[PDB]
Ligand binder design. Structure first.
Ligand code: SAM
Length: 226
């Protein structure tokens, strides 16, 4: 159609099922707009937690003549989801893994129709995988990619009638990403190693036993997997 998306959100779009997208903390509604303009979805919901992004989303939907196809809603996380909604995809992008985890856990009652989740985590994706496990979700695909020098992870999950247990390594590194360790996987975890050794340059070993035990364990895990 009209809108151009970054590679990060275009990658997310390739996992959308037909029907309705609910985009939580939406990018000015640009992902739902793109999804409808490109015939990936026929309807959208754009959730925003504060007024500025809310009004920008309303403006952009109007400007793209999609008022009757994308509902822009003000509320925190999955609170925007209403009981009459029929939702085929929930997208939560451009957030840290812990925030996406808290949105899904706090909003777990909104997942009863078992939509596909497409989550794009900026950092600490382990917390998100822990939460998906707790919610009877199963990771079906993962992408790890780079844009403007920042490495992002995309996690695609669907409901399972039994809880799917992941190992510590799977939770931290990704059960799909671990089995397909591409250049961006290596780059990400080498950078994390550098960051963890750099913290050890700033912490006296006499004064930070607890924090240093966690950092040294994390280093050992990454050094084993790399
Ligand atoms: C970094 S931007 C991400 C924008 C877009 N999803 C993307 O991937 O580029 C984070 C957006 O999420 C919104 N946000 C943060 N906390 C939120 C929450 N609890 N519920 C909904 N939106 C939230 C912010 O206000 C902001 O609009």
């Amino acid at each position: 159609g009209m809108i151009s998306l970054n590679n990060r959100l275009t990658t997310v779009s390739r996992f959308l099922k037909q029907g309705t997208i609910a985009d939580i903390g939406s990018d000015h509604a640009y992902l739902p707009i793109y999804a409808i303009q490109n015939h990936l979805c026929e309807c959208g919901i754009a959730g925003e937690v504060i007024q500025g992004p809310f009004q920008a989303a309303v403006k952009n939907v109007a400007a793209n003549q999609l008022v009757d196809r994308i509902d822009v809603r003000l509320g925190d996380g999955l609170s925007v989801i209403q009981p009459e909604d029929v939702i085929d995809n929930i997208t939560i992008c451009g957030m840290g893994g812990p925030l996406i985890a808290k949105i899904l856990k706090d909003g777990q009652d909104k997942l009863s129709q078992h939509p596909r989740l497409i989550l794009q985590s900026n950092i600490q994706t382990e917390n998100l995988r822990q939460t998906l496990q707790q919610l009877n979700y199963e990771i079906i695909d993962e992408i790890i990619m780079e844009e403007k020098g920042h490495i992002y992870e995309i996690v695609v999950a669907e409901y399972s009638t039994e809880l799917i247990e992941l190992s510590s390594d799977e939770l931290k590194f990704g059960p799909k990403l671990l089995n397909n360790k591409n250049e961006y996987f290596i780059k990400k975890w080498q950078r994390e190693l550098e960051a963890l050794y750099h913290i050890k340059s700033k912490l006296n070993t006499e004064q930070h036993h607890q924090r240093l035990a966690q950092i040294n364990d994390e280093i050992a895990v990454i050094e084993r997997v790399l």
